[model samples]
Target: QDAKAGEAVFKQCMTCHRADKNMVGPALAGVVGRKAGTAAGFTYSPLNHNSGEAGLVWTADNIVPYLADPNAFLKKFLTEKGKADQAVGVTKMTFKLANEQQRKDVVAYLATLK
Candidate 1:
């Protein structure tokens, strides 16, 4: 997945995220296998927090689709769990990593962080 190259791609996220600490977003370290919104110290959106309530664990397969469209992903995630009411509202994450290869590589890089 060319995880090595993802070091550069991750710069796109630095404005709102961090590798080891919480910023505008939560720390990304160990996030690959962790549950969403469970990162300590971050104030997650209700939609994002609800995802964890509905049982969302991060994985390459899931994060790939999520970065394609954050709002769409969260809504679908909640609705599928019969919590459609919790799906309303925007996620704090505004960026969408649209490239298929980039999504995979970034997730591959994140896996190494664990």
Candidate 2:
């Protein structure tokens, strides 16, 4: 039920994303276990690439806050990694989930994609 609902929510993301192909955003297949910003062919913000270089891995827990508020999460992550100076770049993702439940549902759905 949750994943079904999340599929609908994920529709909004289709304009920029896909499960298996890179679109406006990086392909999300296996994103849960993937290193951040490592999706092939997508040019990532320095914030994202640097985050990955600094060992940020994506899990449901990490993705939740990012889906909730990308800029804030990026800023915080970069800050925590002592890379606050490199957080000036903007993420391509601008959509946010409606609430915690939606975030969890989306995460669950994403986890099932692989």
Backbone clashes in each candidate structure, one number apiece? Answer: 0, 0
Model 1 lDDT tens row, 1-114: 678987777888788888889998899998997889899888999988999889888888888899889889989988998999988888885788889888888888888887
Model 2 residue runs over 4 Å out of place are: none
**lDDT on C-alpha atoms for all candidate structures:** 0.86, 0.83
Error of 1 at 91 (Å): 0.8
Per-prediction TM-score to the true structure, in the order listed: 0.94, 0.90
Q: Which candidate leads in lDDT?
A: 1
Q: Per-residue lDDT for 36-111 in model 2, tens only?
A: 9998888988877877887788988899888888878878888898888878877766767758887888888888
Candidate 1 stretches greater than 4 Å from native: none
lDDT against true structure, model 1: 0.86
